[PDB]
Amino acid sequence: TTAPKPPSAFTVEAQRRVEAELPFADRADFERADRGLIRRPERLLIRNPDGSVAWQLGGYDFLLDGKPRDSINPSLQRQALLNLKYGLFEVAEGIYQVRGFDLANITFIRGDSGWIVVDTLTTPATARAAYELVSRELGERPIRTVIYSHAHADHFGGVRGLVEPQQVASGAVQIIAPAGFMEAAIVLAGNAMMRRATYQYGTQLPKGPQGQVDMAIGKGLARGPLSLLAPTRLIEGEGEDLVLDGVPFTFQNTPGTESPAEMNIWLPRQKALLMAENVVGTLHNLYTLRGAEVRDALGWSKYINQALHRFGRQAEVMFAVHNWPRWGNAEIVEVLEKQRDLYGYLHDQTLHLANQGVTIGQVHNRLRLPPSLDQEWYDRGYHGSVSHNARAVLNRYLGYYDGNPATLDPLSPEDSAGRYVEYMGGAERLLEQARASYARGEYRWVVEVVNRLVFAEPDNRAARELQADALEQLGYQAENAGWRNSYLSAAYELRHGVPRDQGSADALAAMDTGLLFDYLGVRLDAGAAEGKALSINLRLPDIGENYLLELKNSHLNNLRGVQSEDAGQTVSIDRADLNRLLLKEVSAVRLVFEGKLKSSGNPLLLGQLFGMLGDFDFWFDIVTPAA
Amino acid sequence: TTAPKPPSAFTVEAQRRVEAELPFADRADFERADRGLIRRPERLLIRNPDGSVAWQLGGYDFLLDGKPRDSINPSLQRQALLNLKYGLFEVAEGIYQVRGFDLANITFIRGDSGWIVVDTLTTPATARAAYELVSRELGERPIRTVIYSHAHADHFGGVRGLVEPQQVASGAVQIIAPAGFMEAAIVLAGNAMMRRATYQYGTQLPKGPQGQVDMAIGKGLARGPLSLLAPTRLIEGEGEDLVLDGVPFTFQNTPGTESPAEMNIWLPRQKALLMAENVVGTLHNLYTLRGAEVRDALGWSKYINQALHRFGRQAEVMFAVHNWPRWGNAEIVEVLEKQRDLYGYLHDQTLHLANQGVTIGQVHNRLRLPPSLDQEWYDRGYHGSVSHNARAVLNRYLGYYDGNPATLDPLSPEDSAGRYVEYMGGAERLLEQARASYARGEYRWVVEVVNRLVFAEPDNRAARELQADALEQLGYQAENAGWRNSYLSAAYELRHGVPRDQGSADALAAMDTGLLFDYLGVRLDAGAAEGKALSINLRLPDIGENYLLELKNSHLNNLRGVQSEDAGQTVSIDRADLNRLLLKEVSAVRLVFEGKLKSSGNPLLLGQLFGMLGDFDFWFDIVTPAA
Ligand SMILES: CCCCCCCCCCS(=O)(=O)O
Ligand SMILES: CCCCCCCCCCS(=O)(=O)O
Ligand SMILES: [Zn+2]
Ligand SMILES: [Zn+2]
Ligand SMILES: [Zn+2]
Ligand SMILES: [Zn+2]
């Protein structure tokens, strides 16, 4: 059978254990998440210009009765309900947030003549909807300044919902960002990350008790066009004190924590501390499972300590770009200390263990937070997990290899699987044993062993169905939203298979030219490039950049600021026009006839290079070997 | 039986295949490695001041007959003999190198009044011995300048063998380094890295056909005290043109390639290009298996391209801090192009594959260099490997997790092993099957499956002996020196068990104070720190630094430039005296009585904190679960 199964007796027991272990009696977050509520719109339904739906919350109604469901980890269910506390809120005098209109929050700070806005959600429609709610309740005011707290799409993505380029061009609107913002906002492993993200975000799952229920730092991500307008002003060095529209702001740069470009904000008049995405209502990711570079827990901890000693000590309210605020100086001091020691403990104790010989394959089964950190709701592994972050720290310092040469040169899973199956007496015998293990509630073992059979025999329905059943129990048990979604998406694909039916101008415009060509080098089909050699001078006059492109030894090189008198072709095109070509907004033929694409030398080389560029299928297999 | 076994028939066949696949007819390296030889001392034996032996080459005599040995990959054997071409060499007019006195080379450049020296080997005794050979053959000359090509111990370690602090202090000797040198020269995962390095370096193996034979970039690493004298001058930005003792030097910074602080050197008078450790006689590591952060192949490739377009185009000789030079402009241009496209192809094609859904557990079995790159001796995987570097690139962008939730929350190997064994019919049945697989030459499979049995039953001699036999065949087959050494060290420990019998003042002095306390936080025993809280102001007047130390929530924090009026204790000590304490060169009691260690507040806190500090056993288990 191919439909979700009820929670097993072992899964039920695991949920009861969560309740026994975690401080459910501490319900203060429920008060915090409702404090200062101005308006919760009755229903929320946000639409995109093309008619698609950007965001809606009606799919979460099953959570509203607040009744426990054993197919959901009760800690995650608690977070799931708190994230449904959406609408317009007062944080402090003249500081408001619209929460639950998208994954992130959007913050409106009262200036003398308009709003200073912090962040802009993921897509213009959600941002626009938030601004409309603000105007209905507080009165319409022009937005004078938009500040990006950091370089992530759930924060800069909806900017065109608030302001337009002509406002920025005229100086009516300023955009403030931490130094390094443009370099960090925008690729090379994009298809792999996006496809792996369908698991983490559970994009194929229904919203419900046996599907997606929450995304930890918010309900989920709004769907729509991605916008991005470049900053007009950057916060340099350690930070800067600015006055915006009569309001004093202190910006504290925290480079290389949750994002390479990030800054906390202190508002001294309100004694309000906006902790960007450094401190949120959950342990955050040191490693995002969809795939990204490992983050620096050591710096993350130190920057939280820096904020504590500078501001925390005088703060009356602390708030963030995800989740809800926390009021009271003693509460804020403790949250800052604990979040600082959370990242610090994860870092320090992973390394303490590693230095004792505990490997990347063992550390998550050994490392446990001490009670003082374990027993706070904002330290729970909803977004990041202690388990995956400990392995992340270890991977950052020691790498993927566990040091045991048995594992140094491993056969691909699909190549060793047939032998595992044979050694275990064949598929039927393996299933018999795995089913007995399943009946004992040993899901973490079952998913490892039955995965071998699925890889040996991807058309073995019985194997896929058992693997799916065990993964699903693990998803029900998961406190982590990303783990849950991944387990349930894996079950879904094992049961149903992968779909057989299957661009942002601003994002492309933000991409450095060198990175664009690095990406084109990634698209290069090695088979097509084999034995070829060509050099092309590329000139981009609007941005005043020159690149030397060299294809040789089945590799595309690009080099900024150099030209070769020996290149076989010289090509001139504005970066703006190159952008349009890639976005299919203009044809190369029309550009050549307009005199916008120019060439000397052999007119064919760039075309020949383009013809070697391959493509990537989005729906590649994950839970089985490639079809 | 517990002694090395002969190469199997499959291993022999694998060696013959290497010969069929690789260009052994290309023997030009043999001429290159002998070119400009001035003196090869008859025997080489270098001793340390305490009487220990730093370096000797007599253990490699078995290689001298040049006869093929099937327990050594013939490509590695070729490299092993070329690395035995040691002694004093002329590279170009007034440019000499002493090769094979240590892992790295040391370079002497004739100035008007003395030597400009590039790098200093690993330990003073080897450096001193190299200088003595130089003086015997070319005449004794003062060393006026020492340049560190980059921030690695096999390059700055022997500096005290050449110069002393009073020479630097008086300005008689200058030390030049790339900007960032001191930050990159010096920890947190040190015990784990060092212990894992016993495998990579094969520190327990004899020198011989069934032991250690070479270390790729050199024969091995000299053993002795580690020295380091701080630079007096840093090469800033992209680089700088300097004149040293009448000789013109162009320094090209290449930050974040083989080392975070590295610079190539162009010598325009001799048209000589010293490629630091960017281009050597082998594919280098993107990931060193002993464990370290993943290196940036993209930047590595671009920096090689930058050197090519700036200098390569006019170079007559190219040489490096490891291995031998290559003469002739056409040869140099090709080597630079190929090394550039080597790192570029590894990067680009790993990502091309990953974007198609190929995982970190599959990529090394899919990625292959094109013939133009595969068929050059300096592109062979002696130091780095295509296999481990491809997985490294993938790990850098996507992380350790393959995206399949079967693998998201894995049981530790020792906890799932008992079940693998049971499912496979028990130990005897598993061995029976594994022995048949062994008889078919399926070593990569045998080491994966028998490893399960060793982990289930670490005292099962029969299992350990088979695992050892299979690993050993893999070590014999390995072209990579680190892989070979690791496979043979694993066999050694399985057969014999781990030893049951078991500081650099300069290195400690080079360590930032914050990093020192970060390291102390890593030593913190969480059990001992539980429930404790303390704050200590630490003042270090000689360096003018203040730190706030806070222990809370089982985590030690240190914060530069802040002090707390609420700290329970204030401690004052020069960093120089703190160094001496840690090195056991002075007792804390003697320092307090000398007035060199001062305290206000509760005199006990720092002592209490120190008492919570744990230690790490060096010889932790790798190939079995912890004893
Ligand atoms: C349209 C893309 C939206 C991107 C929103 C996700 C934020 C990226 C950072 C990953 S993490 O969630 O901080 O761990
Ligand atoms: C006494 C320690 C000697 C360190 C020498 C090894 C160099 C460190 C860098 C690793 S790698 O060999 O570049 O990949
Ligand atoms: Zn973010
Ligand atoms: Zn965010
Ligand atoms: Zn090095
Ligand atoms: Zn080196």
Ordered DSSP codes for B368-392: ---HHHHT-GGGS-SSS-HHHHHHH
B25 touches chain A (CB under 8 A): no
Residues B481 and B513 in one domain: no
| B287 is known to lie in a ligand binding site | yes
**CATH number of the structural domain spanning residue A53:** 3.60.15.30
Dist CA A197 CA A234 (whole Å):
31
**CATH number of the structural domain spanning residue B605:** 3.30.1050.10
Residues A601 and A540 in one domain: yes
3-state SS record for B135-154? HHHHCCCCEEEEECCECCHH
- Chain B residues with CB-CB distance to A373 below 8 A: 553-554
Ligand 1 atom at minimal distance to the Cα of residue A285: 14
Question: Is residue A98 within 8 Å of residue A132, measured between CB atoms?
Answer: no
Task: State which residue of chain A sits closest to B429, comparing Cα positions.
Answer: A423
Q: Measured between CB atoms, which of A522, A552, A617 is closest to B337?
A: A552
Question: Is residue A352 within 8 Å of residue A365, measured between CB atoms?
Answer: no
Q: How many CB atoms lie within 10 A of CB B565?
A: 6
- From A103, A148, A152, the mutation candidate for ligand 1 (largest count of ligand atoms within 8 A of CB) is A152
Tokens found for residue A280: 């949120």
CB pairs under 8 A between A and B: 355
Report phi then psi at A250, rounded to 5. -115, 125
The residues, ordered by sequence, that sit 6+ positions from A207 with a Cβ below 8 Å of its Cβ are A59, A60, A213
- Chain A residues with CB-CB distance to B547 below 8 A: none
Q: Does residue A152 line the site of ligand 1, with CB under 6 A?
A: yes
Maximum separation of any 2 CA atoms in chain A, in Å? 77
Q: Please give the residue range of the domain that contains residue A532.
A: 499-627
Residue nearest to atom 5 of ligand 2 (CA): B154
For an interface test with A, the pick among B342, B404, B471 (most A C-beta atoms closer than 10 Å) comes out as B404
Dist CA A141 CA A137 (whole Å):
11
Q: Which of B473, B498, B523 is the last residue of a domain?
A: B498
Residues B54 and B25 in one domain: yes
Distances (CA, A) of B443 to B418, B473, B476: 22, 7, 11
Question: Domain count of chain A?
Answer: 3
Tokens found for residue B148: 């560190």
Reported for A190-193, long-range contacts at CB under 8 A and 24+ positions apart, including other chains, are A190/A519, A190/B355, A191/A616, A191/A618, A191/B355, A191/B356, A192/A291, A192/B351, A192/B354, A192/B355, A192/B357, A192/B397, A192/B398, A193/A290, A193/A291, A193/A292, A193/B398
Residues B389 and B300 in one domain: no
Name the closest ligand to CA A322.
4
Residues A310 and A193 in one domain: yes
Name the closest ligand to CA B194.
2
Residues A186 and A249 in one domain: yes
Name the closest ligand to CA B284.
2
Q: Beta-strand (E) ranges in B506-606?
A: 534-540, 545-552, 555-560, 569-573, 597-601
Dist CA A276 CA A148 (whole Å):
9
The residues, ordered by sequence, that sit 6+ positions from B160 with a Cβ below 8 Å of its Cβ are B124, B127, B225, B227, B229, B506
A443 touches chain B (CB under 8 A): no
Residues B169 and B284 in one domain: yes
Q: Please report where in the chains the tokens 């950052």 appear, as a residue.
A: A396
Dist CA B203 CA B182 (whole Å):
28
The residues, ordered by sequence, that sit 6+ positions from B429 with a Cβ below 8 Å of its Cβ are none
Helix axes B386-398, B329-354, angle to 10 degrees: 50
Q: Which of A303, A337, A357 is the last residue of a domain?
A: A357
The residues, ordered by sequence, that sit 6+ positions from A382 with a Cβ below 8 Å of its Cβ are A75, A76, A79, A214, A216, A217, A281, A282, A283, A479, A480, A481
Residues A224 and A328 in one domain: yes
Q: Does residue A153 line the site of ligand 1, with CB under 6 A?
A: yes
Residue nearest to atom 4 of ligand 2 (CA): B153
Tokens found for residue A442: 């040993």
Question: A414 exposed, middle or buried (CB, 10 Å; 0-12, 13-18, 19+)?
Answer: middle
Helix axes A443-456, A427-439, angle to 10 degrees: 160
Q: How many CB atoms lie within 10 A of CB B262?
A: 29
Dist CA B474 CA A130 (whole Å):
62
Tokens found for residue B165: 């602090």
Dist CA B593 CA B603 (whole Å):
14
Q: Where are the alpha helices (DSSP H) in A355-385?
A: 371-374
Helix axes A443-456, A413-423, angle to 10 degrees: 110
Residue nearest to atom 6 of ligand 2 (CA): B154
A192 touches chain B (CB under 8 A): yes
Of B408, B457, B453, B401, residue with least CA distance to A444: B408
Of B318, B397, B319, B385, residue with least CA distance to B352: B397
Contact call for A289 and B372, based on CB within 8 A: no
Q: How far is the CA of B323 from the centre of ligand 6 (A)?
A: 10
3-state SS record for A288-306? CCCCCCCCCHHHHHHHHHH
Report phi then psi at B274, rounded to 5. -90, 105
- From B288, B343, B385, the mutation candidate for ligand 2 (largest count of ligand atoms within 8 A of CB) is B288
Q: Which residue type occupies B25?
A: A
Residues A504 and A486 in one domain: no
A190 touches chain B (CB under 8 A): yes
Ligand 2 atom at minimal distance to the Cα of residue B288: 14
Residue nearest to atom 3 of ligand 1 (CA): A153
* CB contact residues (below 8 A), chain B span 321-340, against chain A: 337-338, 340
Q: Does residue A54 line the site of ligand 1, with CB under 6 A?
A: no
Dist CA B14 CA B20 (whole Å):
10
Query: How many residues are recorded in chain A?
Result: 627
Dist CA B437 CA B443 (whole Å):
8
Residues A254 and A272 in one domain: yes
Tell me the HSE value of A427 on the side-chain side, using a 13 A CA sphere.
Answer: 14
Beta bridge partners of A250: A241, A266
For an interface test with A, the pick among B187, B188, B289 (most A C-beta atoms closer than 10 Å) comes out as B188
Dist CA A131 CA A264 (whole Å):
23
**Residue A91 DSSP code:** E
Contact call for A486 and B398, based on CB within 8 A: no
**CATH number of the structural domain spanning residue B441:** 1.25.40.880
Q: In what order do the strands lie in the sheet containing B263-267? A: B239-244, B247-253, B263-267, B272-274, B317-319, B326-327
A353 touches chain B (CB under 8 A): no
- Chain A residues with CB-CB distance to B530 below 8 A: 370
Tell me chain A's radius of gyration from C-alpha atoms: 26
**Residue B61 DSSP code:** G
Dist CA A488 CA A483 (whole Å):
9
Question: Is residue A352 within 8 Å of residue B524, measured between CB atoms?
Answer: yes
Protein residues within 5 Å, CB atom, of ion ligand 5 = B 152, 277
Q: Which residue type occupies A562?
A: V
Residues A132 and A230 in one domain: yes
Tokens found for residue B228: 């380091």
Dist CA A166 CA A620 (whole Å):
42
The residues, ordered by sequence, that sit 6+ positions from A2 with a Cβ below 8 Å of its Cβ are A465, A495, A496
Q: Beta-strand (E) ranges in A43-147?
A: 45-47, 53-56, 87-92, 95-99, 106-110, 115-118, 143-147
A514 vs chain B: nearest CA distance in angstroms? 11
Residues A140 and A243 in one domain: yes
Dist CA B421 CA A433 (whole Å):
12
Q: In what order do the strands lie in the sheet containing A534-540? A: A555-560, A545-552, A534-540, A569-573, A597-601
Q: Which residues line ligand 2 (CB under 6 A)?
A: B 122, 152-154, 221, 226, 258, 285, 288
Q: Which of B478, B498, B518 is the last residue of a domain?
A: B498
The residues, ordered by sequence, that sit 6+ positions from B90 with a Cβ below 8 Å of its Cβ are B36, B38, B96
Q: What is the residue-wise DSSP string for A562-610?
A: ---TT-SEEEEE-HHHHHHHHTTSS-HHHHHHTTSEEEEE-TTHHHHHH
**Residue A12 DSSP code:** H
Of A198, A389, A174, residue with least CA distance to A294: A389
Name the closest ligand to CA A223.
1
Distances (CA, A) of B233 to A388, B145, B171, B352, B365: 43, 11, 11, 42, 46
* CB contact residues (below 8 A), chain B span 397-436, against chain A: 397-401, 403-416, 419-420, 422-425, 430, 433
Contact call for A345 and B445, based on CB within 8 A: no
Ligand 2 atom at minimal distance to the Cα of residue B292: 10
